Amino acid sequence: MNLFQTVFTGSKQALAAAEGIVKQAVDEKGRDYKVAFPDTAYSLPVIFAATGKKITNVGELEGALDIVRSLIVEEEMLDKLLNSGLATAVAAEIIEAAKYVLSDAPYAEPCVGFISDPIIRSLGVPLVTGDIPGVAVILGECPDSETAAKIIKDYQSKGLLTCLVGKVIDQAIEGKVKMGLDLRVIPLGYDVTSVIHVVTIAIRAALIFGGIKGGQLNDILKYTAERVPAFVNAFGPLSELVVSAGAGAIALGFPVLTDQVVPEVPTLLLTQKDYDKMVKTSLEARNIKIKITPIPVSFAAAFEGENDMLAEFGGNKTKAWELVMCADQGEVEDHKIEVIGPDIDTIDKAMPLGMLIKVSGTNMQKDFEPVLERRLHYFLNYIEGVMHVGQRNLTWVRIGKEAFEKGFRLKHFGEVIYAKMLDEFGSVVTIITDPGKAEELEGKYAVPRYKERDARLESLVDEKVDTFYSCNLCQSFAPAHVCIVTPERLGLCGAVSWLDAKATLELNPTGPCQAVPKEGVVDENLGIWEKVNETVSKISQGAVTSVTLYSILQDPMTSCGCFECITGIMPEANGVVMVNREFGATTPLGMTFGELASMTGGGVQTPGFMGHGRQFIASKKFMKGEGGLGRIVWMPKELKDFVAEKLNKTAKELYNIDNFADMICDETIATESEEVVKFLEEKGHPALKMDPIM
Amino acid sequence: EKAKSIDQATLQLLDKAKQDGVETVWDRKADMKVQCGFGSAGVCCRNCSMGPCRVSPVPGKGVERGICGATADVIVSRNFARMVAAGTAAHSDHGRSIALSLYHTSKDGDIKVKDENKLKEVAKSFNVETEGRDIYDIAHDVAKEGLSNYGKQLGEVTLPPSLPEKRKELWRKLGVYPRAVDREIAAVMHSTHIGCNADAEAMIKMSMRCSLTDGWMGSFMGTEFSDIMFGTPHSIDTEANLGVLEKNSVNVVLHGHEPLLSEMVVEAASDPELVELAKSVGADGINLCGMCCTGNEVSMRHGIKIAGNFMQQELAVVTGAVDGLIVDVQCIMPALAKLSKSYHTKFITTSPKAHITDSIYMEFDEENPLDSAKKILKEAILNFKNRDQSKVMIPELKCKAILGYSVEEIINKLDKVVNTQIGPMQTVKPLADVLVSGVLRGAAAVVGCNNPKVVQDSAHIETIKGLIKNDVIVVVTGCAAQAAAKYGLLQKEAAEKYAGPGLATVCKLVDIPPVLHMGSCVDISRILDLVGRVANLLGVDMSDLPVAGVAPEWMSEKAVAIGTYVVTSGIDTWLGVAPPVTGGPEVVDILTNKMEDWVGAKFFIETDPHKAVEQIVNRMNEKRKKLGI
Ligand code: SF4
Ligand code: SF4
Ligand SMILES: [Ca+2]
Ligand SMILES: [Ca+2]
Ligand SMILES: [Ca+2]
Ligand SMILES: [Ca+2]
Ligand SMILES: [Ca+2]
Ligand SMILES: [Cl-]
Ligand SMILES: [Cl-]
Ligand SMILES: [Cl-]
Ligand SMILES: [Cl-]
Ligand SMILES: [Cl-]
Ligand SMILES: [Cl-]
Ligand SMILES: [Cl-]
Ligand code: NI
Ligand code: NI
Prior knowledge:
The structure is cut from a larger assembly and holds chains A and B. By secondary structure, chain A is an alpha/beta fold. Chain A folds into five domains: 3-102, Helicase, Ruva Protein, domain 3 (Orthogonal Bundle), CATH 1.10.8; 117-286, Rossmann fold (3-Layer(aba) Sandwich), CATH 3.40.50; 301-448, Bifunctional carbon monoxide dehydrogenase/acetyl-coa synthase(codh/acs), Chain M, domain 3, CATH 3.30.1650; 457-540, Ribonuclease HI, Chain A; 565-683, Bifunctional carbon monoxide dehydrogenase/acetyl-coa synthase(codh/acs), Chain M, domain 5. The radius of gyration of chain A is 34 Å and the shape is elongated. The radius of gyration of chain B is 24 Å and the shape is globular. Chain B is of the alpha/beta class. In chain B, helix 4 (72-102) packs antiparallel against helix 6 (135-151), helix 4 crosses helix 23 (557-568) and helix 8 (181-191) packs antiparallel against helix 9 (200-230). Classes of the chains: A alpha/beta, B alpha/beta. Chain A binds chain B through residues 1-4, 76-79, 81, 263-267, 269-272, 274, 277, 280-281, 284-285, 361-363, 422, 426, and chain B through 412, 415-423, 425-426, 430, 433-434, 436-439, 441, 471, 500-502, 505, 509, 621, 624, 628-629. The complex binds iron/sulfur cluster (2 copies), calcium ion (5 copies), chloride ion (7 copies) and nickel (II) ion (2 copies). Residues 145, 174 of chain A line the site of one calcium ion. Chain A: This is CO-methylating acetyl-CoA synthase.
C-alpha cells in the first residue's frame, strides 16, 4: 500500500478500536457516567483544541466518535492524510478517556498514563527557556536493550525530555535507565494510544503559554509546529495504526524518524538504520542545536588566553602549515581523522605540523574557505594546553606538557576541527608530522590556494570599494577594539582580508564582520570617513570616537594582540622601526617585541605605535600620512629578507628607491640608536631628508 | 469577436497598432478566413509534380487515393513525418553551431570554458580523458565527439547517461534507436519522397527515430555545450512583459534562438566605449531585453529582462521604443521588416541561415564575435537619436520572475531537504521521495509557442494553474515559460496563491516557486534528463513514472518534433492545437492509441485546457496505481 492508504487503514483501525472501547463504557457504566482525565482544566485537550467543546459524560464521549469519522476522508491529497492522522489522535484520546472510565486508576508504575496540568506548567517553562532542548517521543521496540539504553541515555545527556511508549519501556529498564520526571525520562504506556499523553503536553502548552483558545486548531497546530521541539523515533515493525499515529505527529509539525523502510517524505518522515546516528539525525531533523559539542582535555573559550612545552611546531623552528580546501574528489571525503608522521609520544625532550582539511558539502564556495582557516586558530586555542598563532603557511603551534600528561593526541585535533566545522559551517558543509608529506603538500595545494587568494587583492585598490567591513571578534580580550578592514589595510591578525570579511557576513549575517558604508569623506591621506568613525563609536561603546585609517599619530586605529609585526616611532632618526614576533632581541627603542606589544594592543588609541600583519608593510597606505614606508629605518634581518622584493618595488613606485631593503638597518649592522643614525647618514635614507615625523 | 489575448499590456498595444494603422499576426489570421480543410486534416500532398493531390479525410466519400495511388493515411503520415524532420533540422543546426563554437574556444579568446566541472562530467559521457590535461584540449575533443553524433555513418552514437537502459533496449526492439542527426533527417526526407514508404505504421516509427536525434542529442548537446561555455544556470531574478522597456534608455531587444550572439551583445553592452556612446546620444544607459528562446537563454544565465513571447514580438515594435531589434534564426516573423518601416526601429538580421528582405543585414562574424556584437549594438545605440518620443507608449506593466532552474540547480536546491546523516547529496532522491509518497501527485512539463487559433497565453495559464492546484509540480520552457513569467506564476508567492496542499508544502521546504522555468526548448532536454534521473534512481523506465508533457498553444514544426520525442521517450503528451492528422484514421489511431503499446506513452489532443488538466491527473493516477504509489 502507498503512504496514503496505509494511513487511512490505520485511522479506520483506530476508529474501530475507539468504537469497541466506548461500547464497553456504555454497556458497563451507562451514557451518563462522568468522563474526565486526572487534574486537568481542558477536559479532553485534543477534542478541546479541535472543537473547543468539553467532554463531560460517556454519552458526549460517544458523540466525539463522529469527530474521528469526519477527519477520515479517503482522498489522496496531503491535507486529507494529515486530517486522517488527527483522526487517529482523537481516536487515541477517546480510547484513553474510556480507560479512565472503566477503571479509576488504569495506569500503575512504571507507566504514568495521563500527565496532569501541574506537570505541564512545571515542564513548560524550561521548554520555553530552552533548558529542555527537545522532546524525544521514542515508540516501538529496539533490536536489543543495549541499543535502547544507548539512545535514551544519550537523549537524556543533552537535557531532552524522553517519553517512552511500547516495548521500549521494558528495554530501558533492562538496560538500566534511570526513569523519572526529574530524570527527564517518562514511560507513558505500553499501548500505542498512550502516545496521545505527550501530544496533550504539546497542545496544552499552546493553550497555557501560547494563550490560544479552544477551537483555534490551525493556531494550535502552528504553535506546536513552531514552538514545541518534539519528534518521534519509531523503532521495530510499524503497523498501519502506528503509521497513522505518525501522521498525527506530522500534523502537529513533529518529524517522524524510523529504522524501518517507509515512503520517506523530506523533513517529515525519515528512515535511519544506523542506531549510532539516530540521535544526531533526530536533533538535526527538528533543528535542535545542543550547546555542548571527543578529547579528554577541557575545551572552552576560557583557554583562549593561553610551564614548558612537550612539542613545538612552526614559527622559526620547523615548517608547519594549515590549509582548508573545498573539493568533491581527489581523496576520501569523510570524517577521516588521519595522522601521517612521527607521533608526539616519540618525543623524549622539549617537528612540523601539517593541517590539510577537506570539505565538499553543498553550498560551499571556493572563496568561502579563508573564513575557515581563521576559525581553526580559535578551535585550536580552546584546547587546554595548546596555543595557535600565525596565519596559513607561517603558522606557530606549541603543545603543552599537561596535554601530554592528559594523553591528548593529534587525533583529537582532527576531531575538534571536523566537529566544530559541522557545528558552525553546518549550512555550507589530515595531520602530517612527516617532513616529506609536509613539504610536497605545502606547495601542492596550500601555496597555490594562497597565491590565488592573495592574487585577488594583489592588484586591487581601495580606489573602487563602496563599503568597508568592521570586525569585533578580538573584543573578547580588547573590549574597545573595532578592527576596520580595507583591500589595503588588513585585519591586524593578518588573516581576515577585506574579502574574507565579506564572506563572513554572507555566512553569518549577524557575525563579527559587518558592513560599514564609505560615506562622508573628510581626508584621503589620513583616512577619515564620518560613517567609519560612527560605526566604531557604537561597537567600542563610546570609548573610541575619532579615528584615522592611514595614520599612527593622529587618532590611530586601536590594536588588539594578534599582530605579527609592530611599528614604533623613532623621532631621533625622523622615522619608525619594525619588529616581528619571531625576534627575541632588543630594538633601537630599547624594547623587545613583548614590551612593544604591551604598548600597542589592549584596544586603546596609542599614538606613535601600531600593530599590523606582514602584508601591510608593502602597502602604499602604510603610514602614508607620515611619508609611507620611506620612514622604515630599522627592521630585523629575517623580516627584511622575507619582504625584500615586495618593498623594493613599492618603494620605487614612490621614492624610486631601488634598494630600500639595503638602506634599512638591522641587528647585524647595529641596534643602538646612535649607531643606527650613523648608518642612515652614510647610506642616505629618505627619512632623514623627509619632513619632521612629529 | 473572440479576445485576442489575456495579457493587458498586449491588449493595450493591440489598440495602438490599430490607431497607428499597422498589421499584426491577429489581423493576418483573420484575413486567412476559413483556412483550407485538406491542409488542416493533412490530406493534401505536394511531394511530386504529378500533383497537387487532395484525398477525402472522410472515409468512403470523395477521392480515395492520390495520382501515385497513395491512400489518405500515407499522405497524412508523410506530411506528419516531414514536420518532425524539419523540427529536428532546426534544433540540429542550433546545437551544431554550439559544438563548432566549443571547438574554437581559447584561454585568451572570446569564447571560453566557463563551467569546467560540467565539461569534465560531459567528457565522461563521450569517453574523453580529463586527467592532467588542458581544459581547452578536453573541450576540443568533447566538441569533436559531439560533432560525430551529427554525421557518423559507421559506429554507434553517444547518448547521455540519464537515459535508462530499459528505454534504450525498448527503442532497439522497436527499431527506432537513433542514428546520426543529419542522417536521420535524410532518411525521413527520402522515405517521404514519391514512390517510397506507403505504410502509416512504418512512417510514424521513422519519424519517432528521427525525433530522438533531437531530444537526446542535438537539443541535449546544445544545452550541455552552452552551459559549458556560457555557464550552467542557477536561481536568478528577472522581470517579464513589455513593461520592461524603458522610455529614456536605449532599448535593444534580442529575438531569435542562437545563444552566442545574445551572449556577446550582453558582454558588448558593458564595453566602456558603448556605455559612453549611449550617454552621447542622450540616454540613461543600455536597456537589454530578450524575446522567445534567445531571451530565455540570456535571462537564465544573466537575468536579462524578458520583453515578451512569440505573438508579442510585433507589439514590442508598436511601443515605438525599440531602437534596435537584433535577430538570428527561428520564429522571427518576416512581418517585422514591413512593420519596422512604420517606426524608427532598426530591424537587424545577423544570420546567413535567416536573411529577411528589407531588413538591415549585419552578419555576425563567428571568428571575431565580441567585435562583431559591438559593431551591431553600436548601430542600435546610434538609432536612439531617431526616436520620436511623442509616439512612444510602453504599457506600465511588468512582472517579477525567478528562473535558472537547471537540473544541477534543482538538485542543489533539493539538498536543503536532505538530512546530513541519511539521504545522499547531489541526487534527485528528494523529488522521487515526494512523488512516491504521494505529496506531489506527479510532474508535468508545459512547453510550447503561441497560436492565433488559441487566445494568447490563455491555454498556457489555465493549464499550468490547474496542474499546480492538483498538487502536480510544473516545469516550463520557451514561450510557455515566458507566459507564466508575465502572469506571475514564476514567483515564490505563487505557491500559497495557486498551488495545492502538497505542492505548497514542498515549495515552502525547498524554497521554490510552484512553476520552475528550465530554459528554452533546446532546454527541454533538461526535462528529459530530470525525468530520466528519477527513473534510474527508482530502477524503472520513464513510461512507469506519473509524468506528462503539454503543448497548449504550439505552432512550430519544432513543437511536433518535441512532442514526438517526448512520447517516444515514454512521456504522455497533450496537444492544445490539433495537428494535421484528422484525415488519416490509421495515423490518428497510431498517435493516440497504438503508440502506448510501442513506447508506453501516447498523444492526447485536447483544445479545452480544463478538460486536459482532468485527463492528465487521471492518467497520472492510472500510472501511479500500476506502480503501487
Ligand atoms: S585582528 Fe581584526 S580582522 Fe583579525 S580577528 Fe581580530 S578584529 Fe578580526
Ligand atoms: S505523392 Fe502522390 S498524391 Fe502526392 S502529389 Fe505525388 S502523386 Fe500526387
Ligand atoms: Ca488541581
Ligand atoms: Ca473533497
Ligand atoms: Ca540482556
Ligand atoms: Ca523487534
Ligand atoms: Ca551530462
Ligand atoms: Cl524542571
Ligand atoms: Cl520540523
Ligand atoms: Cl482588437
Ligand atoms: Cl504594417
Ligand atoms: Cl518611434
Ligand atoms: Cl540522481
Ligand atoms: Cl486569469
Ligand atoms: Ni591582536
Ligand atoms: Ni586581533
